Design a protein around this ligand. Sequence first.
Ligand SMILES: Cc1c(C)n(Cc2ccc(C(C)(C)C(=O)O)cc2)c2ccc(C(=O)N[C@H](C)c3cccc(C4CC4)c3)cc12
Length: 270
Amino acid sequence: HGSHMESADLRALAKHLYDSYIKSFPLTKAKARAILTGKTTDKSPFVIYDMNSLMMGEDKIKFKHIQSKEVAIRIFQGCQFRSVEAVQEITEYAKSIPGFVNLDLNDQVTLLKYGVHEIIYTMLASLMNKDGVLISEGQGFMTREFLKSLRKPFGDFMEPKFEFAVKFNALELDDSDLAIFIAVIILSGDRPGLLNVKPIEDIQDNLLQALELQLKLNHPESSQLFAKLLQKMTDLRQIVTEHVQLLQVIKKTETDSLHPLLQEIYKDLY
Ligand SMILES: Cc1c(C)n(Cc2ccc(C(C)(C)C(=O)O)cc2)c2ccc(C(=O)N[C@H](C)c3cccc(C4CC4)c3)cc12
């Protein structure tokens, strides 16, 4: 429909959330895609396609701590070290969402608990194509087929992430669309264990309308793209369930997981 004063607010909200999306996250989908196509002035990332290429990229790494079994551990421990840094960047973006910090602190924890994994899955699509995924803030690129070649419990922990990304990146969403799409996931008013739901649903419905207005403007072709995104929010919860069910098996009937003190030692040291 036509414009008005309310449309001026949703476009300003979309820009405000976009400004926070650029600052909260260092590698946006715009630059992440520019690295994959080689059309960026930055150096080409190191490619990990076989076991031999992996034993050359680790020589560029500073540390050296964990045999064909230590590979599946170091690789898994790697994204675990980015997942902990992910929450740092996701929380800063969540705090920048207008009205999130005014919620109850117990709800802010509950929204971030069940929602951070879906954002990790969502933003992971911005870093990967049909061949591999960008790792270490665009410094490396690990092949999808190489992640399949890992040991049996670890050859299937990245594949659900690639299958969702191929269907998700087929929508050609940009940083402006993904900015509003993440906030809607954060402000999911039906997270198990919320205190005040009404103030959260007001923000989500406000973010939903700012998202639908964004998609109608930023995507003239392909109607019902807003309905396609809402189905992806339902797909993520099914994928996170299969991921958290697989993560508890590798952390209890496989690895030791990383020690709590060692993780903070590696964070502040390098
Ligand atoms: C498997 C893997 C993925 C898939 N990546 C991409 C990735 C991007 C972005 C995200 C988030 C969630 C932040 C996102 O933006 O969506 C997640 C995963 C990686 C990024 C870096 C590394 C990694 O080993 N680094 C260094 C070398 C490192 C740092 C500390 C400790 C160690 C080893 C214990 C000694 C290694 C691994 C991976």
